[PDB]
Amino acid sequence: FKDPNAPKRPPSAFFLFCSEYRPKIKGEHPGLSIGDVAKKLGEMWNNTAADDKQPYEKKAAKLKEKYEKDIAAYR
């Protein structure tokens, strides 16, 4: 992803949109789906009261990806 002291192609997963609705492979729960993390991107604000409970949008991939923050983090 690289060059001799010179940019990475910065690592971040964007696949995991659902951060607190999906992830329950942890405690009581051997099963929640691999699809439950990527196609349900409205999660966190749908835990609040009746004020502003709508959005969740942005993410961050890896592969070439982050040309705006931290491709400088090896450039």
Added chain:
Amino acid sequence: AQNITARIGEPLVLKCKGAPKKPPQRLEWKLNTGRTEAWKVLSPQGGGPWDSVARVLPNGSLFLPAVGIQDEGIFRCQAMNRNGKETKSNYRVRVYQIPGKPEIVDSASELTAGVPNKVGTCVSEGSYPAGTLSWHLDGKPLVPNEKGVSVKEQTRRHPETGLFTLQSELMVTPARGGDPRPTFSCSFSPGLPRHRALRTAPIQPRVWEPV
């Protein structure tokens, strides 16, 4: 959107052809209402092959929230959608949502007339900037031209909770008459649309008996 602390992402300059609503903005559909640099179809949406910056879209789900200075306003609207005209806007919002609860500061009541006034407490917020005062304390009409009734500005200030502004009635002619009845009128607006305010008193120089 355009006058709200809320949602997100559709591209204008005013009433010429090619102008969807909610700020901001990202290409040429020109200038002077809004926050980003450029003036049309907008997303730093994020995801996909430009997850660095964005996901730009042709179906029209492309995202950034709100208002400002330089994006969808005053233009001779040849900034290619097609058309066409000299049209205008400018908008910058402040916060308002579902309201509530009372707000309390600034209360002290009785020193009748004559000397430096001390604490005079009547309320509001909301201007660019807030306002003024006068010289009062509390009641029926004042007495003219005696020893100086004075400023509000030792009252318990707070500008933007909505709980101190102007009280404008003129004892420019000050008083030594008697009872707590020189000047009084202050009464104005509450504070904030999540929890609002309420109102308080005139401004106070003491009368006495060193009899």
